[PDB]
Design a protein around this ligand. Structure first.
Ligand SMILES: O=c1[nH]c(=O)c2[nH]c(=O)[nH]c2[nH]1
Ligand SMILES: O=c1[nH]c(=O)c2[nH]c(=O)[nH]c2[nH]1
Ligand SMILES: [Cl-]
Ligand SMILES: [Cl-]
Lengths: 164, 164
């Protein structure tokens, strides 16, 4: 695609006025930014048989798990992606031998999840290209445009993170 | 969730330095912003039996279809969402009687898609609450923070929209 047709869509909206179209354009862009980021990011881990939910989970453990693991609760909390893509992510990666349980359904209610030796090797091997992609993708803004986006994104998510 | 644990994740990353964590935080936020927006937006159309792919398609036609329809090509191009969620969106909404074909596989290669009378009624009825949500969700930034986000988002998507 181009952003050649942003002006088409802006005027399409404008025909709906029998009071500006920036909100609907802004979200359009974000949707599309999201998709685009998706494609760019999956380049790192696709060769390796993972969807994004899988990778995200692994990487959460890598950066944020103490040695005994995270409960899926606090996993949820520290991960990037928590939707319905995350339905079968745990049970999938258990199959793959990338994560393990720690105390199944015995003495302590629900179990805690950590990286297996191969899980860890994977992430470490991908990590550099993952940060590469992460850096590259943001490279078209200057830093501090990067930090200003950081702020604004934060701020909206903030205002959203309270329920009706 | 809170953005209470942004600082946890920032320090988790920082432990990976045996050169800042803003890029990975920024994308984290966007993922999460995306999910959050998703939940907020679906409030308009869920009662009405539509996923987001369905709604997005309908709304594209509503704002951007000429009276004879869009070819799925230029549909793709003007819509917000083009991923694998869009796999069975057309064929679903055809079932539902919300969109129609115009000349099937006769004289002119591929067919063109438009809103049915009920399709249109739906959108018109939802539209106000859809723009409401669109406005509300952005309300925590001032305008011109809204336009600065518009720019930055545009700019990144731009830099991304060229292939390797
Ligand atoms: O992800 C989105 N879905 C939509 O249906 C929509 N509509 C809109 O104006 N912006 C967006 N963004
Ligand atoms: O959507 C994302 N997925 C990730 O796996 C990831 N990793 C990251 O640092 N930011 C993001 N964003
Ligand atoms: Cl739209
Ligand atoms: Cl991450």
């Amino acid at each position: 695609d181009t952003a050649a047709l942003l002006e088409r869509i802006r005027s399409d909206w404008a025909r709906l006025n029998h009071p500006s179209a920036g909100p609907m354009l802004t979200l359009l862009l974000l949707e599309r930014l999201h998709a685009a980021l998706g494609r760019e990011i999956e380049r790192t881990y696709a060769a390796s048989g993972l969807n994004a939910a899988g990778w995200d989970l692994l990487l959460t453990l890598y950066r944020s798990a103490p040695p005994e693991g995270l409960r899926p609760t606090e996993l949820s909390a520290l991960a990037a992606i928590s939707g319905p893509s995350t339905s079968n992510r745990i049970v999938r990666l258990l199959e793959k031998g990338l994560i393990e349980r720690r105390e199944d359904e015995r003495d302590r209610r629900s179990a805690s999840i950590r990286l297996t030796p191969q899980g860890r090797a994977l992430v470490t091997h991908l990590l550099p290209a993952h940060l590469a992609t992460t850096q590259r993708v943001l490279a078209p803004l200057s830093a501090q445009e990067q930090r200003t986006l950081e702020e604004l994104a934060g701020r909206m998510l903030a205002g959203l993170e309270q329920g009706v």
